[PDB]
């Protein structure tokens, strides 16, 4: 009967979930966690990555 | 200064090695130019300089 209100909560929580787990993508970089790039790669192009 | 021929690669920012840590260190934010060339007829003798 009132799925119109549930849509708001679904969209908000869904957007938040997409945003938070988007933090895992590497965007082409070597690793998705920065300390890995800092310990296991040379700073001069670690900056670029 | 004078170093071994194989250590011209070691004269670079963010390098890892022996003389880089203990003899001469280049900053990662270094701006400038580096020159390297053989000095065997000058700094090398058959008896050992």
Min Cα–Cα distance to chain B from A48, Å: 13
Question: Tokens 């090398």 correspond to what residue?
Answer: B44
Take residue A45 and report the two structure tokens written for it.
């192009």
Sole residue written with tokens 């390098």: B15
Q: What is the dihedral of CA A30, A32, A38, A43, to 10 degrees?
A: 50
Which of A:24-43 have CB within 8 Å of B?
Answer: 42-43
Tokens linked to B40: 């065997």
For this entry, resolution in Å reads 3.0
Q: What is the dihedral of CA B4, A41, B29, B38, to 10 degrees?
A: 20
Q: Which residue of A37, A39, A44 is the best one to mutate when testing the B interface, meaning the one whose CB has the most B CBs within 10 A?
A: A44
Shortest Cα distance from B37 to chain A (angstroms)?
Answer: 24
- Tokens 């001469």: give the residue: B24
């Amino acid at each position: 009967a009132l799925g119109k209100l549930q849509d708001v909560v679904n969209h908000n929580a869904q957007a938040l979930n997409t945003l938070v787990k988007q933090l895992s993508s590497k965007f082409g970089a070597i690793s998705s966690v920065l300390n890995d790039i800092f310990s296991r790669l040379d700073p001069p192009e670690a900056e670029v990555q | 200064f004078v170093i071994r021929g194989d250590e011209v690669r070691q004269i670079a920012p963010g390098q890892t090695g022996n003389i880089a840590d203990y003899n001469y260190k280049l900053p990662d934010d270094f701006t400038g130019c580096v020159i390297a060339w053989n000095s065997n007829k000058l700094d090398s003798k058959v008896s050992g300089n």
